[model samples]
Target: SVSIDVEIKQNCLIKIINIPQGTLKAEVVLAVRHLGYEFYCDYIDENSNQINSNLIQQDQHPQLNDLLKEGQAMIRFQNSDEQRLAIQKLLNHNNNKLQIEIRGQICDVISTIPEDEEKNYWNYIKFKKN
Candidate 1:
């Protein structure tokens, strides 16, 4: 018989960089399908007075096995719009709180969900302002 133990840390962060003006809007969707389960995510970065988005799919590597195994995806969305939106949207919709910032030509918006209601799926859609 063999036994395995795993410890998970569920904290994440996102950031944005150099964007141009006149960009209407943008979004990012990441879909991970594993063990007959599909995980979906959306991200947005309303920076530089523009909207940006991205879409990531799991075709070649089916189950996030490689990513998780390699610990590479832990820091997903580094300096990417997908990362920013996911963090922001989660914050705003869940907590009924809005965080916004502006630096130079970049404007950053972040929405967060408190630790208590993190398990409720319905709460995710409730906070979508974009």
Candidate 2:
């Protein structure tokens, strides 16, 4: 029997922003996978049996779709380690063109969690006013 548990996790979330308008979830997933392929590679079943194809399959969730439509999306990692490792790589690669490429397009990745809820809220307010 397979059981899945869903809960809020601080360490498992990543912030993605500046996606191109009308971008589809599949595009975002592909972009993210491009950066973190090693982490998402199926270790259990190496061949055609790899069911865990998406690195951030949770983006399929409707709640997440809303954010994607706004040119930003949160990527849920399989675990905190996966999130950290990917962030580390992004930091090194982008510094060590850029914000990294999403199918040759660039997007920003926020590795550190945002602590100020009000700060985000203010940004939302600014968007609303504009």
Candidate 3:
């Protein structure tokens, strides 16, 4: 299975480029639908300031599938306010803790999870319990 994920810190706009235009896009649609998410999409890069994006389910905007841009597209995880409150109460931790930026604007930390074999756990941004 192939997958691409955009991690949003504090709910920001996202764009996914170079996506396979075949069943993969269809899979994304099915995947999002299977999650019962609201699937939000907005055009324009207000890279001006700290901004946000959209999501699927809960609100069910069925028009989202029409907004894909073939080889590329933008997506957002909205209902975040509601999802966060709900998710936080369950995790008892802040989802914002998952993002750690450097240089330009991207990273991967699968090594830190399950186990940090590289002994470079410090590369991750984390917090301690109070």
User: Which candidate ranks first by lDDT, i.e. highest?
Assistant: 2
| Model 2 lDDT-worst window of ten | 41-50
What do the candidate models score in CA lDDT, each in turn? 0.31, 0.51, 0.33
How much does each candidate deviate from the true structure in C-alpha RMSD? 18.1, 16.7, 19.9
lDDT for each residue of candidate 2 in 1-130, tens digit (9 for 90 to 100): 5559764334445555666656654566677767764322110101122234333456553342332224655455666777676767766635632264555667775655564622443344346554
Q: Specify the highest-TM-score model's number.
A: 2
Off by over 4 Å in 3: 1-12, 24-26, 41-69, 82-130
List candidate 1 segments past 4 Å from native.
Answer: 1-4, 13-26, 30-40, 43-108, 111-113, 122-130
lDDT tens per residue, model 3, 13-101 = 23333344243434433333233355443222212233223545345444333344444333344544543442334243553432212
Candidate 2 residue 47 C-alpha distance from true site, Å: 40
lDDT of 1 at 74: 10
> What is the TM-score of each predicted model, taking all chains together?
0.20, 0.49, 0.26
lDDT for 47 in candidate 1 is 16
For candidate 2, what is the lDDT? Answer: 0.51
What is residue 128's positional error in candidate 1, in angstroms?
16
Sorting all predicted structures by TM-score, with the top scorer first, yields: 2, 3, 1
